[PDB]
């Protein structure tokens, strides 16, 4: 299945690169640096907590000033990252809508004579509203999650290199689970939307034509049709939920195995090679 095989792709280059280029030059650096700085400051706050509690069990004496400085810097960095994400999303929507409008200005007549207006209205309303409201938040949360994941793998590697050694099998399993889940999820989502739209359209038309439907005394036939549609929607939603749950469960086991490995290696290192306790606690957290 060459067409199907081509269908299975992330499609980053075609659209994501366009988006990021339309973002600009200032705000790309601002967003990247703000995100990375905020999360590095968070990791630093945790590390400094570890060192302070280490020295608490008996260099300096009053760590609290440094702790407050890290907390304030982190708060400001989080604010900056949020504002930058919102600004980038708004500016992308602004500098995309006008471009699309001026492009539709210059369309030829045959384009309108062939393409159904449903497609243009779809790509002018649904996609526009999505990138108005749903793209910035999703991008922001994806960035936050992936960067926190990178931080929480790097730190535990820093605590115990044996975890870093053992990470490759688990990270491989994670990769495969993620790939397969995405492959199924895209399809399930599209299926859900498609199965959703007929149902509500059916409802509308059945409301606008009740007299005729009662006239034929064919009410039972439409009852069966509605039951069929509702089942076709419910089972698609059920499978979407079940696939989501499978992803969650498998990643949960992977995280639990990470917890076990980190704990075992950390305690082993902290018994004989005498690793600092605070670093152990930070890694386990």
């Amino acid at each position: 299945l060459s067409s199907v095989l081509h269908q299975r792709a992330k499609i980053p280059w075609r659209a994501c690169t366009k988006y990021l280029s339309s973002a600009g030059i200032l705000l790309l650096s601002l967003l990247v640096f703000s995100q990375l700085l905020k999360h590095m400051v968070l990791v630093a706050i945790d590390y400094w907590l570890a060192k302070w509690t280490d020295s608490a069990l008996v260099d300096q004496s009053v760590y609290a000033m440094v702790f407050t400085l890290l907390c304030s810097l982190g708060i400001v960095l989080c604010l900056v990252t949020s504002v930058t994400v919102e600004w980038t999303g708004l500016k992308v929507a602004k500098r995309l809508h006008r471009s699309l409008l001026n492009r539709i200005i210059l369309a030829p007549m045959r384009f309108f004579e062939t393409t159904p207006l449903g497609s243009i209205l779809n790509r002018f309303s649904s996609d526009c509203n999505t990138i108005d409201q749903h793209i910035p938040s999703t991008l922001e949360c994806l960035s936050r999650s992936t960067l926190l994941c990178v931080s929480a793998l790097t730190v535990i590697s820093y605590v115990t290199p044996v975890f870093l050694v053992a990470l490759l099998p688990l990270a491989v399993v994670c990769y495969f689970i993620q790939k397969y889940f995405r492959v199924a999820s895209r399809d399930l989502q599209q299926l859900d939307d498609t199965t959703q739209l007929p149902l509500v359209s059916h409802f509308a038309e059945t409301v606008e034509g009740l007299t005729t439907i009662r006239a034929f005394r064919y009410e039972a036939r439409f009852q069966q049709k509605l039951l069929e549609y509702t089942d076709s929607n419910n089972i698609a939603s059920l499978f979407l939920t079940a696939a989501n749950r499978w992803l969650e469960v498998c990643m949960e086991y992977i995280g639990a195995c990470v917890v076990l490995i980190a704990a075992a290696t950390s305690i082993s290192n902290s018994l004989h090679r005498e690793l600092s306790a605070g670093l152990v606690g930070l890694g386990l957290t």
Partner: protein
Amino acid sequence: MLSRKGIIPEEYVLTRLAEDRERRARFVSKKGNCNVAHKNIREQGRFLQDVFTTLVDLKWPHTLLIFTMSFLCSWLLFAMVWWLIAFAHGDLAPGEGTNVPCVTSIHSFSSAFLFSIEVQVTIGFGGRMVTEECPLAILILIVQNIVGLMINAIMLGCIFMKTAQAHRRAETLIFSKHAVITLRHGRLCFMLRVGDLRKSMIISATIHMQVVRKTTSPEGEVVPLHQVDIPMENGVGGNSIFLVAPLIIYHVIDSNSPLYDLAPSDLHHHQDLEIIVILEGVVETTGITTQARTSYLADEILWGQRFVPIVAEEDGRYSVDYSKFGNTVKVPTPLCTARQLDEDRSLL
């Protein structure tokens, strides 16, 4: 947290819709596999005989794994029990006690394991041996000999049945994926091609052709998969055939044959006409009778095509080109039905 799947519709955003073989299955496959849902059948309880039969029928490496595990489990189990009994009688205790042990020279569990090996494999080194004054030892020795001997017997039986059966596990009778309908000797006739590949003569080669259609009776009866046998237009009308070189099994179409209403228009893919060709026979080398099922749907039939002759008269013997086996070339074959063709021939 996350987007929480965005539980805030707040508006039914109207979006205009934009544009963006499997009907009929086959119960016999071209290879010969048979698939029919045997739904809703009272199930007979599977006795252990089913387990034993599955044991006989497994593959070779898997049989090796089964029997290695079986032997090792038997040895280890009885070693465990020997160790237990020697421990319960003070043999495993410190030496120099007056009490003579149940089994001589049982020091560790490993010793009992080697002793169990000696007993069941019938090796019996004899540095360690059973004595009297421990009747439980004799009882368990009897039990273990009986079990080990039954296990050896069953292993021998499995190996024997495997050597017997597996010689006849090769099915190399090849049909074609395409069959034709051509005029021979004036009359229209169906043709198919069959050959043998493993160079083993097939005794009593019988061929059966069967048309399966949902043919409702004129009186009114409804039949889902009616099957009618088809003659073979042999030289004697019998169904015995002899297969050395690939043949053409030409079932001549006459008034009796159900192909009397076939037309190339009726040759379209979505028709309820299915040909089953079955080659029964016994292979001389083994003697185990075998079948060779094959099916042909309408789309796998090619109207009005002859076959490439294959038997080349070489200088010493006859050559058979199996590469040119299933290749068909067109010919001038009319598309009239058998009845119209017969009436036209009679009027002429």
